[PDB]
Ligand binder design. Sequence first.
Ligand SMILES: *[C@@H]1O[C@H](CO)[C@@H](O[C@@H]2O[C@H](CO)[C@@H](O[C@@H]3O[C@H](CO[C@H]4O[C@H](CO)[C@@H](O)[C@H](O[C@H]5O[C@H](CO)[C@@H](O)[C@H](O)[C@@H]5O)[C@@H]4O)[C@@H](O)[C@H](O)[C@@H]3O)[C@H](O)[C@H]2NC(C)=O)[C@H](O)[C@H]1NC(C)=O
Ligand SMILES: Cc1cc2nc3c(=O)[nH]c(=O)nc-3n(C[C@H](O)[C@H](O)[C@H](O)COP(=O)(O)OP(=O)(O)OC[C@H]3O[C@@H](n4cnc5c(N)ncnc54)[C@H](O)[C@@H]3O)c2cc1C
Ligand code: HEM
Ligand code: HEM
Ligand SMILES: *[C@@H]1O[C@H](CO)[C@@H](O)[C@H](O)[C@H]1NC(C)=O
Ligand SMILES: *[C@@H]1O[C@H](CO)[C@@H](O)[C@H](O)[C@H]1NC(C)=O
Ligand SMILES: *[C@@H]1O[C@H](CO)[C@@H](O)[C@H](O)[C@H]1NC(C)=O
Ligand SMILES: *[C@@H]1O[C@H](CO)[C@@H](O)[C@H](O)[C@H]1NC(C)=O
Lengths: 228, 1075
Amino acid sequence: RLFWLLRVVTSLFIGAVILAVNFSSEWSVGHVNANTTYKAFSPKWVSVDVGLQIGLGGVNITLTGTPVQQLNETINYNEAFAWRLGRSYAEEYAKALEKGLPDPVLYLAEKFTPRSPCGLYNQYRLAGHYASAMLWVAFLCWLLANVMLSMPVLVYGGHMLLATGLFQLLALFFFSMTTSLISPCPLRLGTAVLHTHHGPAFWITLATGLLCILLGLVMAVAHRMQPH
Amino acid sequence: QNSISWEVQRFDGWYNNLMEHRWGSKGSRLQRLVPASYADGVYQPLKEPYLPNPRHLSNRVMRGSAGQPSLRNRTVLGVFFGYHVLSDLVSVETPGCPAEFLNIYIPHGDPVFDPDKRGNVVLPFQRSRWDRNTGQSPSNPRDQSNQVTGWLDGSAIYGSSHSWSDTLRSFSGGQLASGPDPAFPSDSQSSLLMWMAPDPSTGQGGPRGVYAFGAQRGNREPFLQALGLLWFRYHNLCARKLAQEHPHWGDEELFQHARKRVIATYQNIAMYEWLPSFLKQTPPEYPGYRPFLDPSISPEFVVASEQFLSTMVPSGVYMRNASCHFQGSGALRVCNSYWSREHPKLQRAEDVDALLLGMASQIAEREDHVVVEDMQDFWPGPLKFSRTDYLASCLQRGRDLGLPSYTKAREALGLSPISHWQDINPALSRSNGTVLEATAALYNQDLSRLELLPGGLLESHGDPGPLFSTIVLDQFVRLRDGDRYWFENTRNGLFSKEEIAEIRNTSLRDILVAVTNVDPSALQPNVFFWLAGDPCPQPSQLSAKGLPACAPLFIRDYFEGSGFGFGLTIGTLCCFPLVSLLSAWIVARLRKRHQTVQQFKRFIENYRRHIGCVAVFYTITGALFLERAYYYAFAAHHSGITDTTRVGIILSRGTAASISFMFSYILLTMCRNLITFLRETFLNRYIPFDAAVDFHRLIASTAIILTVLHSAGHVVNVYLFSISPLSVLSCLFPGLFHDDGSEFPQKYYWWFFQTVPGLTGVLLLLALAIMYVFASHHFRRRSFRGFWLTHHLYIFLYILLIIHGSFALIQMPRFHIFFLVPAIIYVGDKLVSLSRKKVEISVVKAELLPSGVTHLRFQRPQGFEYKSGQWVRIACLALGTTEYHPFTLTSAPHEDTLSLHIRAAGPWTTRLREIYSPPRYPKLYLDGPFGEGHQEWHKFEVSVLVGGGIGVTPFASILKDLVFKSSVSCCKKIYFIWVTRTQRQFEWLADIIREVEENDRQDLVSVHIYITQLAEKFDLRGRPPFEPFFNSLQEVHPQKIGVFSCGPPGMTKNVEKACQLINRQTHFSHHYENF
Ligand SMILES: *[C@@H]1O[C@H](CO)[C@@H](O[C@@H]2O[C@H](CO)[C@@H](O[C@@H]3O[C@H](CO[C@H]4O[C@H](CO)[C@@H](O)[C@H](O[C@H]5O[C@H](CO)[C@@H](O)[C@H](O)[C@@H]5O)[C@@H]4O)[C@@H](O)[C@H](O)[C@@H]3O)[C@H](O)[C@H]2NC(C)=O)[C@H](O)[C@H]1NC(C)=O
Ligand SMILES: Cc1cc2nc3c(=O)[nH]c(=O)nc-3n(C[C@H](O)[C@H](O)[C@H](O)COP(=O)(O)OP(=O)(O)OC[C@H]3O[C@@H](n4cnc5c(N)ncnc54)[C@H](O)[C@@H]3O)c2cc1C
Ligand code: HEM
Ligand code: HEM
Ligand SMILES: *[C@@H]1O[C@H](CO)[C@@H](O)[C@H](O)[C@H]1NC(C)=O
Ligand SMILES: *[C@@H]1O[C@H](CO)[C@@H](O)[C@H](O)[C@H]1NC(C)=O
Ligand SMILES: *[C@@H]1O[C@H](CO)[C@@H](O)[C@H](O)[C@H]1NC(C)=O
Ligand SMILES: *[C@@H]1O[C@H](CO)[C@@H](O)[C@H](O)[C@H]1NC(C)=O
């Protein structure tokens, strides 16, 4: 019964990676270790490691001191500013600015605010909206590829595996048309720069899309020319 | 870690005072000196019935010559350095919008704006940004918000934020990014950064020639660009000097040190150099930093400072080089230089230095009510008009903001009261005071109404009036004494004692000498004054004589050339049906290669459930449409988008929900397994499940009508958008549009073929036209495969219909709310109908009978076990497609070679009769029985089988099987009663009645016939009296008796009434079976 366990493993892995990637904030990942200013009313410079993570629905900005306790305070921050149709970015930025959290986090949050010169908000609010809708479409197709394989219509259960594998690479494109503009915008942090490159979720979606596109095709060709 | 041993000053302004982190910030709100003076009390501005007309007030008092010299010899570099400084502090010019205008109304026959006496002409004017948390009750009226850092912190050189101070920096040392020329900044940062207004003299609105400064609009005059370039080059100079004296320093260290030095020099110059010259009295002194003073910009400061600086701008500005040869007539006119992109003279650093050395020697105009014509008549128009009165827009802004009057705002500052009009300016009325009379006549001799611009300008003799002077002075003292990063603050740790004593000895001559590399003896010690001993005198006072005239007016026409293209695009959209019609036509040609009351009563009797269903469906759709349209028209809607597009937006937003619902449930209609299960339940007695295709076509037609309405509404919308300014469009669809002053909206074809909704809407129109024309009655009878090939577009349709709402243009997507349940059910039923398979019956024999019926008989597959009264659905592929049509079997189960009786009633049936004509070769695709096979007449001693109309189809099988089983096995006296109108198509049924009568010798089945058709018949060669029937039935034999009935609603209702009226006293179950 090895082949049955293999089929169950493949189906469950594909479903799990679709679900996890649609809700993961790791599509674009940058990281750097800079020397920045901690916060207002103090002339003291700190040593921290700063990095942002963009996930189709908002950004995570993490400020963590290399010594977590270096200025009598513990430095471990992880703030989230979301721009999806449900929420608003400017109100979140205003509340964060009224709170008083450290300056580099406020800066990296400002880079994505609406009407900023860099214009990084309206191409992340729509690309991350379409690449999160073409990943809810590649789920209803995976469910149908799970059903049509249970009650054998495999001749038609090998096309849902060309639709799921295509609707993933049709969403790995909307989030591919954004690094074209995030590259010119500067992200200088004190004496260091910040390079944001494609992260785990992107490569995982690429691998899963390729796997489904190939598996559906091979199984369809086989069960067509040889229903063994 | 480095040499930045201080707290770097933020760009936005926050966190400057410890207690209140918000006082001087990017979007703070202006703090009034006097309670708001709106019309209603909250946000309504005073207007023309109450206060005189702005364009008629400007003409009467603020109009005159342009050759008057200043009384204190203030050089025009002072005027424009003031224009520069007062853009570091306050900016209330950008219109924040839920788009709301208050226009200027020109009088009749204005020689400049209404030259041909065209009745009344309107100058547009828009309200500015307001604080969203104010303007809702007379306790807190609306307050505006300035969009620049309200400190004197060089918020005009380095921008007022941090993402802004990056887009104009090079990170190559501490330096602001220059262009190919080291002297000028980089024009290459033009979009998304600066203000682009079309040069009103030519019309060019391109991003070439728009430099990158820290003030969004510093390119408004070459004379303001001159000071912008001066400060830019000074920053670069001091920074490169720092680099050549501290080589190992980074980029940030150089930038921050040069920035703090430039900011300190700027503050020193501005305060202690410009104020003692603007109003001729020195700021008092510097006490300790006061952490409690309120440094909030007031609107009266805006009025005083800027709308008084506008009183002394000259007509033309001179130009001279180091030895002052005033050529580079050469005095470039002002009214032709607004927003100049590339000026043929100011194309090199030497020319900018010449412009500065010429401004620093030209005595600006005098300080009184008279304003030159280069601002009064020829100020660049904000929208649609290319020209605009300045002083008639400054009054509209003073009444836009809640500015006080001149007598109300003269007693809230401790100043004495004025008696009458002659006492406003006592020295003015001593010589030609016929302007105070002209302005009293305008105000109906009512002194307590002066809008505080004509009241302030009328009191200023040689200096600003006693009213403007106190406002400017105390505002600047509050700016300096409430600032933590003030260069004279010894607590902030920015500069030492000698670095403060060195910054406090810097004049504007030192900066000009350092930047322009000019000998210090070619200028004057105080650049803001020319005092009869300073070098390089003026040639002659510059009157507006001998200067090039001002470029005349022209109205701007959006939607001017692209009207024919718009009409052609609409005509092409409308001729989508014609292209599909032609394609299907060539496809066909290629494939060929007192009594009326009773009539209405019978009709309403038959068609009750159909009327109920149609009424409920159309009620629901109309309710959705009415909800949306009512919510939009006059209801709880933020009236941002609904100004003149009420009709279009109402139409579109009302039809959208209705068509989404109609499409989702027209998908629901075509699911046949659920219908096959449901039509054998009590639901059928309330809704008819045999009219699903008619309901389908009805829904389709209604949906196409509503879709045409939707598309027409959106076409009207797209037209009304292509003529709206950018300032209006930029707050209907925020995020999609941005308001740089270019003001030209996107063309129609941008909305149509370059947006997701428009493009997918055109695609959906094409797909709908194809699918609707190929599905016509006169185009599916010809080719069943044409019909079958196009209709698979509905998946493409339901893909597009998700992309059509995938945007935040008007509202949130709601189609996916409607589409879930019907699509889930339909996909489930498709999987159910696609799992089971049965195919390939062989037709044994098929004779052709009259009246249309075609007796068909095919072999019985081995596994085929079925009951009496079950139908099968068959398809012949020889002619057309694999279209499954249902037919009730007419053979007893004990008999092999299952039979059928098919009645010619349309395309498929006539084609099938043509196929099996000439008596049987083709083979069908029988799809098994579909029924419950209710055999409940075994539980009743005596049954009464009643069939009417079309419902007499399975009774042949029923009776044959019943007599066979009664004979073989060895249900008492079952009776069959069938009432028909014409007895036309059912003659084979009479043959079967005869064959059953002949077979039965035990006298079980007794048939009875009622033909019920009078006076209209062919003689064919009464009524079914159920009332005495049951009375005699129980009498003749003492049997519970079943009276199962199948037929039209009239007959079954009649037999129901009969059996119920006669039941009350056996059982008489009356179990109406729909086969
Ligand atoms: C993307 O970001 C979101 C939002 O942060 C993440 O979701 C949150 O996940 C955390 C982790 O479990 C949940 O728990 C919260 O975390 C709090 C973190 O506290 C730090 O930050 C505080 C402000 O945010 C800060 O006050 C504090 O230090 C400061 O104050 C101290 C005094 O209290 C002072 O001594 C220090 O020197 C310093 O000045 C902390 O450093 C934690 O405190 C709480 O337990 C809290 O529950 C959150 O609930 C989650 N968010 C929500 C809205 O529920 C998300 O995981 C991120 N994405 C990924 C992929 O990780
Ligand atoms: C002996 C006999 C038994 C029949 N038994 C049944 C039955 O048990 N159940 C049943 O639903 N129909 C039954 N029908 C109707 C028969 O299916 C239609 O005449 C035929 O399927 C379609 O006719 P057409 O396509 O040639 O003409 P069309 O012009 O396509 O016929 C138009 C009419 O037929 C109806 N119709 C079309 N397709 C279907 C379909 N797939 N299902 C139902 N109605 C349709 C439409 O509502 C429309 O009013 C029976 C017909 C005959 C002659
Ligand atoms: C007037 C236009 C239309 C007509 C005349 C029409 C007619 C029909 C007919 C006759 C059928 C199938 C009949 C059969 O089963 O033999 C059909 C099937 C269908 N039509 Fe339409 N239809 C029309 C418009 C639409 C529209 C707009 C839709 C859009 C959703 C649509 C969706 C369907 C669907 C979903 C089927 C299902 C067929 C199947 O898969 O079994 N139809 N239509
Ligand atoms: C000129 C062609 C059309 C234009 C310009 C157009 C434009 C629009 C726009 C702007 C919306 C709302 C935008 C959004 O928020 O997503 C909309 C919604 C919609 N349009 Fe169109 N449309 C057009 C044609 C059609 C056609 C032919 C259909 C028929 C299906 C159609 C069906 C819809 C539907 C169902 C919505 C529902 C919106 C929703 O999802 O709630 N439109 N259309
Ligand atoms: C960061 O600061 C530490 C503090 O000692 C210093 O040693 C280090 O060189 C600095 N590095 C950078 C990249 O600024
Ligand atoms: C200034 O302009 C005069 C005009 O002829 C010219 O002769 C002179 O060379 C210019 N430059 C100076 C004086 O430095
Ligand atoms: C300092 O005093 C005055 C103030 O402007 C100035 O005239 C003088 O030249 C300055 N002394 C210098 C710069 O050595
Ligand atoms: C102002 O400039 C004119 C220009 O020649 C000069 O005659 C006059 O004396 C100057 N004013 C004073 C007070 O010196």
